[model samples]
Target: GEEVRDAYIAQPHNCVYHCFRDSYCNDLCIKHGAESGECKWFTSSGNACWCVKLPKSEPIKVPGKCH
Candidate 1:
């Protein structure tokens, strides 16, 4: 069942972002349960925050930090 699990894990069940600024990333990180998002900045990156389950299909948003 490893393959099946991996396959499911590899799905588009992650949050990817082209953080406009480091602060943006940090905010995401904090909300994402990271003590800090202090890593090298990148225009595009992916974070492991996904909803994995059938019937749980719903639009997700990070919410209220855009300024």
Candidate 2:
């Protein structure tokens, strides 16, 4: 529940990126999947945590499927 809520809440609406590279990118993942192959994660209360990153650019519209 936290993951989904974080992703959605942090996404598009509240996404922000800073000069610091260590910052987390939660919004990025929610709106545009992920900037890189691996997503950043942290631990809070013995659970995973995430940061919200602003979308770099508009995502291309393509129709496809994965099996």
Candidate 3:
């Protein structure tokens, strides 16, 4: 797996809370074609999930700038 630094992450359907666990981030990353994910401090009050992308994973690009 390859680490993706400064990744942009958010809830799949809604933006109610920030990602706080590796499990949640990993699961979310898998949905987006990544092997795993790591939650890291992003904004002052929010967190960003760093995803591990591997071969054969079909990743997609979402609109909007990453914070």
Q: Residues 16-40, candidate 2, lDDT per residue (tens digit)?
A: 2221233343333444544332243
Range of the 10 consecutive residues with the lowest summed lDDT in candidate 2: 1-10
True-structure RMSD, every candidate? 10.5, 12.3, 5.7
List where candidate 2 sits over 4 angstroms from the true fold: 1-10, 15-35, 45-55, 58-67
Candidate 3: residue 32 lDDT (0-100)? 71
Kindly give the number of clashing pairs for every candidate.
0, 3, 0
Model 3, CA-based lDDT? 0.58
Model 1, 39: alpha-carbon shift in Å? Answer: 5.4
* Candidate 2, lDDT over the whole model: 0.30
lDDT of prediction 1: 0.35
| Model 1 root mean square deviation, Cα atoms | 10.5
Better of 1 and 3 by lDDT: 3
- Candidate 1, clashing residue pairs? none
What tens-digit string does per-residue lDDT give for candidate 1 at 37-62? 43242233443322223122322444
List candidate 3 segments past 4 Å from native. 1-6, 10-17, 54-67
lDDT of each: 0.35, 0.30, 0.58
- TM for every model, in the order presented, reads 0.35, 0.20, 0.50
